[PDB]
Amino acid sequence: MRVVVIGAGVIGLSTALCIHERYHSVLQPLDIKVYADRFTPLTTTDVAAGLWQPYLSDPNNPQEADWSQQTFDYLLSHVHSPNAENLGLFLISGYNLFHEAIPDPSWKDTVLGFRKLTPRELDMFPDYGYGWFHTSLILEGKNYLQWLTERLTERGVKFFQRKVESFEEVAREGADVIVNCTGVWAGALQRDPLLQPGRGQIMKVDAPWMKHFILTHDPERGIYNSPYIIPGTQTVTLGGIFQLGNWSELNNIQDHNTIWEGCCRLEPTLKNARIIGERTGFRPVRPQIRLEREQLRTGPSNTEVIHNYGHGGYGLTIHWGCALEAAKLFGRILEEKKLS
Template identity: 45%
Template sequence: MTDRELKRFPDHKFGQAFTTVKCECSSYLPWLEERFRKAGGRVEQRRVSSLQELGDGFDLIVNCSGLGSRALVGDAGVYPVRGQVLKVEAPWLTHFIRDGDGKTYIYPGVHSVTIGGTRQEGDWRLHVDGGDTASILERCGRLEPSLKKAKVLAEWVGLRPSRRNPRVEREKVLLQGRGVPVVHNYGHGGWGVTIAWGTALDALGLVRQSLKEMPQAKL
């Protein structure tokens, strides 16, 4: 950033400006699901407490259960990182602004501006925290004073499924007396959308490898 541009941020001595893209997950995820359906996939919603429940119906399992992998496959290395954000009405903002530590950010979107945030490791709370809301408004207001007149449209909390390293690997699990290959793909933390295509391709390679070994498999 130039010296003139940095004057907008008196608390900072260095900054970068660049062009990038933002993925609107509220639109992106339904698009992915529709693409899956058109390719012949079927979506079924039900609670699975153990992989043993799937042993008699499938010859191969892809585990993308995120935080659920703690219970589903006994992976104690998976932990939540709580994130809280606000959606505000500020159509005059058209540029992303992000503080150096990544915890304070302003991301304009199609319908609103997302401001945040929090990064609270080991925190399972899913309710909105008033103290976090006040902190987000104060921190983002320092970066962009015009936000003080923005209307808060919504508050949202999510848990990032984190792990020291994302788990993308294959193992054979004994399910109801049969050895069933399980391809794991989880633990992406706050970078799920960013690295999803890459790890999905790796997982797909493991799936193909498994199918070659049992051509009559049911996925």
């Protein structure tokens, strides 16, 4: 069985791992291959802090709340594990700030010790009069990518640096199943009017005193386009940028100033923190995640395509549930191709 996963970001590597662990049997000899244009240090997955937190407003698709919850429960059970440190996995508590009273989120019982902020706590944030506190998890993109790659490497998965021009090219070069995990660049392989680059920029800062996440929200600004402070393992993530339709890979001075002004006003201690570096990424923006099997009529016999893209700002928060569902879609192919 020949399988080609296109892309080496969070989605591709986890779908490749999930499929390989659930379907690579002696009864199912899988030849899995990873095809990517950009790898482990230079993807949009690396730019992500890795904080587990779904949308403030409920999605149009209810399968997504299940996939996000399923990712949390999985990560939590491995949070005290001997491998936690390599994945970049750890528990964290923090603040959710608002200007108005908001209903409690769907994930209020998934996270640990959810409650509303007390007045004396709210008194610490002059600009916000309402908010939450809970304990979540972090899965840093870069460390997790480094973990997945190495775990795949010891499983025979061969990685290849190349820009894939079309599905047919991969199919004709002997592919049976094409797992499409191209993120925002899925439009280059197949026209998707529901796809747009959710451009984001961040800063990496040396602020070790920071033990909590601090996320502010504003409907005027929109989702992920308002200041956020996310402490990592070696550095703190300074964010708050979202530009729908922007394809500029370079960092810009206005977004730098926006992030810095916003986070230093949120936490004045930050004014003394050292800028380690800055990065730019593209959230694969869609009304909902595209996670389905598509038949491609390549002459007589058809080559199968599993699309797994359009994860927006929640690709780490949801990855595992999407991986298991894509694995479920991979199982249906095996049985429909007389192999189960």
